[PDB]
Amino acid sequence: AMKTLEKVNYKGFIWPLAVGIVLWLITPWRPGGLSVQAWEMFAIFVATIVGCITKPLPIGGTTLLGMVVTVLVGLAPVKDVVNSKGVVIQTGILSSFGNSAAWLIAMAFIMAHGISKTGLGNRVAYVMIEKFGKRSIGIGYAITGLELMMGALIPSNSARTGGVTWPVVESISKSYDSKPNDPSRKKIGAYLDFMAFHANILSTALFITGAAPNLVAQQMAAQKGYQMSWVSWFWAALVPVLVATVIIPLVIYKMYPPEVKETPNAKNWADDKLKEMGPISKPEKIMATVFCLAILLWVLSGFFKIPQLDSAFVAFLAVTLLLITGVLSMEDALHETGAWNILIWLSILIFMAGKLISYGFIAWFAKFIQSEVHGINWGLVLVVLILLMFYTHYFFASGTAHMTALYLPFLTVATAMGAPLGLSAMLLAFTGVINASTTHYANGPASILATTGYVKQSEWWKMNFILGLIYMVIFGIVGTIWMKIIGIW
Amino acid sequence: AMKTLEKVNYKGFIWPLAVGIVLWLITPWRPGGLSVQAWEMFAIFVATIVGCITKPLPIGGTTLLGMVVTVLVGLAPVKDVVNSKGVVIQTGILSSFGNSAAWLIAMAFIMAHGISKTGLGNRVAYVMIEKFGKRSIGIGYAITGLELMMGALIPSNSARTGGVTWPVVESISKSYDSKPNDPSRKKIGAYLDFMAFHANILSTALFITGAAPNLVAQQMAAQKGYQMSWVSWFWAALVPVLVATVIIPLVIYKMYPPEVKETPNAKNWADDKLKEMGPISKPEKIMATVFCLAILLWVLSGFFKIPQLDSAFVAFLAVTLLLITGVLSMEDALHETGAWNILIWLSILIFMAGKLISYGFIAWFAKFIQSEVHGINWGLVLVVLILLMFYTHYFFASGTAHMTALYLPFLTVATAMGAPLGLSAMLLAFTGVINASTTHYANGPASILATTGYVKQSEWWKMNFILGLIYMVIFGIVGTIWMKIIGIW
């Protein structure tokens, strides 16, 4: 019954494969000490990322093409190759899909559809349109304050983004007639999408329990003899985080203003639509009960490290509660396509970047940086190390892997050339937080919010580059002078 | 705006939950030598399967609830617990989803949607409705011939079902107005679904390359000192397979007839609808070409063991070709809910059965049966071993794992009690083939065809039980005397 082919953007293929081909041919001229497979994997990964920007096919199609090409040129098995002694000496593409980040985000997508089905989403949206809808930046500051308060309680940033702030932004933009993948997207949806992302960055920076890279940094710094202690982290971050809480939202507002900037009659419009919506119903009350069990289990996860409190498992059990309760048919959860899309593409990207790690590319880079800096005072060693830890996150889809790979090497560099370990440790952990202001695979929240269709990826990458400059300036300078005002060095 | 709740079948919970609770509560009197964790995992598994038949929720919902319950009672982590030397000492629930069987079947589901989207399916359906179909048992024997022909070439049984025979059955039954999850299913669809399953069983029985358990059996028999020789297997199976090729289709036709048994004008109807479909189009030409590249890559799978020829990867590569050409939009591939349903539920069931293995349940069973059979002549030893090898496949979601677990133990039993090594090696390998006539998770094809909505699972299990009796009689006795005519025992 199909007559013509789907319109495919073939020009989108010109840039990635050309880039890949060119870097393929530069394999004889690799830096030395590397590996031919390491350089080939770098080539395929960069080609795939450029494909995620030039968009031949949606990102799922581009990452599927990348994964298929990866297997085709012999850089990754399909099944895990097992040691002899049980170890997996090289992992295949099918294990890509047993990833915690992807599964947490996908199940969070399913519960967000639950929220919007009940009608709870629009109830929360109208409550917040009444209390801050007068002036859009009021709503923006509302959700940044909400994220900042959640930072100290919900120890995983992806749970905060996919469970709370993204449902809020979606609801609010639906009540404003702002739908994704549409010109309509720019009435308020895109500004609040980007603001949610950077609020998540700020909340991760404020608390040592904002994201797992923070705790990796804490363990690695403790290995070298420096104890971060929540209050230590909090007091070191308080003033730079506040300077950022004022600078970043306003630079976003000037750079990415939200079309509709004032709703002078927001209070009465919101009250009317809450009155017509009627009192809360039993599907919405059930949904709220499951939502607060998800929040409470995520918070207890912070104190009890057990499987039953795993952030992905909390989402799984929340959705199975949603199924047994009757809020959600399983045909409702099945054709909620964002979950399976993110499962495909984010798992493939995490796998390819992990291969970048496992072939010795990041290790070679750490060794290169260890050998290249020698005749310099420790202040400039610190500036250069902050810059390198920042910009190497273009080659990471995790954050925990980034810290595991480069935090202890860079920290040993800094202390080996005279810099004080507490200051350097704090600076590098902060850079590990502000790394998120880069790619769409930087962390979980970046993967959610760069893909919802409200913010194009041109704008995402460019504005994140600008904000990364501002974040580094803020944290570097303000945090260094604040951290000796408090006595850390 | 949701008004009232989705209807949930709560009575469906009584039987599984009752069974689970009682099997939990009799844990102290477990058979002895069995871990409490093995017995508890057994209880959860039986509860989940009983739920898949009593249906408190769709199969995805019940297996998800089962997996959540598994984690809740401390029988499975969420992340893999790794040794401190790379070994995995306990496997978590997220690794379940990097499964080749589930992913192969899911990508085949999306490629079948491609076939039926282009209109290629209905062209194939009308060609065979014109060449067979005036009498529906003609269609049944046609698809049985198709499976029999593919058995010697395409080494994966699920690839044969999901890549070829299921699209054929769906196409034909859509052209016969026999449509799933409704009474209309009984015009011809259910008959062709069940007949496809058993054609796949027979073709797997005919050739030593019919499914992976065959090659596991041959390697184990060589470990014990008996060499199967393709022609060996073919010659030993041919006459029993022919007796089955005559008996089983007729027993299915009498037991499960297809309401529409005669189409007196089938050839002219098919010629009419082929005339009006018009000449083949470029979308269908592209789809047919990628289909036959999939088939040739699957046949090369039989001779070259390389990742680029992996049957799951071949499915991935076929779908990415379908994406590059434009046959399939990526939103088309995203809202095909059968693929994600099969991924979820089949991955969870394979995971739970694996836990059945890894906790030592099947090992205790092998040792118990080793202790139980002692004072009996070897003919009765062979009968009871065939019976046990058949009926233990209710506690297996793989088949390869079943063979790896119990084939060499049962064979050492049989040979240790006087039986001739070639005879029971062949009898147990045949039993491993005809094991499929059991559950809906028996093998890949069983999970595909038992779930399409054409065959209820009540009738599936019951009719599979009857046909399993018939399969055992045929293969056991007829194959034993036929294998005595040849120089085997």
Numbering used by the authors:
A (entry chain A), B (entry chain B): 0 to 488
Manuscript excerpt for this entry:
DASS proteins typically have a molecular weight of 45–65 kDa and form obligate homodimers. Each protomer consists of a scaffold and a transport domain.
The structures of LaINDY determined in malate, αKG and in the malate/αKG mixture are in an outward-facing, substrate-bound (Co-S) state. The architecture of the LaINDY binding site is similar to that of VcINDY. In contrast to the similarity at the substrate binding site, major differences between LaINDY and VcINDY are seen at the cation binding sites. At the Na1 site of VcINDY, an arginine (Arg159) is found in LaINDY, stabilized by a salt bridge with Glu146. Similarly, a histidine (His392) in LaINDY is located at the equivalent of the VcINDY Na2 site, with another histidine (His401) located 4 Å on its extracellular side. Based on these well enclosed and sterically occupied cation binding sites, it is unlikely that sodium ions bind to LaINDY as Na1 and Na2 do in VcINDY. Rather, we hypothesize these two positively-charged residues in exchangers act as permanent surrogates of the Na+ ions in cotransporters.
